[PDB]
Amino acid sequence: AGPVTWVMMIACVVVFIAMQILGDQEVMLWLAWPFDPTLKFEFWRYFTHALMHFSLMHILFNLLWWWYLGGAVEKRLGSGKLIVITLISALLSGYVQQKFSGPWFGGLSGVVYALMGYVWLRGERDPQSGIYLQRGLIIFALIWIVAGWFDLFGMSMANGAHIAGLAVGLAMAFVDSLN
């Protein structure tokens, strides 16, 4: 697994530890989407919400997916593409999330949804570029999407972040296939 895939896992872990030690609210205060006008110039916050997980299922599921899909993208398409997929989804999912619901949310799953939509749609519309979501895994992705939508998980779900994330990934596979 490439460096981008790896450092993102590291960072999510460091952040998760920090959340267990200092508490969730303490870490949110530093990392959440700006929740006050004074924080508007704190540029990291438009991204760092992606780094926070609020339970062991949260971090574990998001990182397993990240590891696989993220790692696919990085090896077949390169580190640069994964960085750009990540920044775009993170920023866009974050924006839609806070519009609907407020600045209080976190998780790498806006981004994981981007990677699902991206890998699949690009494997459908662009097979030779080496990227596909195997039939079988598409089903488990599809169920993942569904669980989110219908609030199965037992978690409170960042609704905006999840769709925005998926759209972004589809939009990007679209744009990328047509070449």
Partner: peptide, 4 residues
């Protein structure tokens, strides 16, 4: 908090 909303998860994601």
């Amino acid at each position: 908090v909303r998860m994601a």
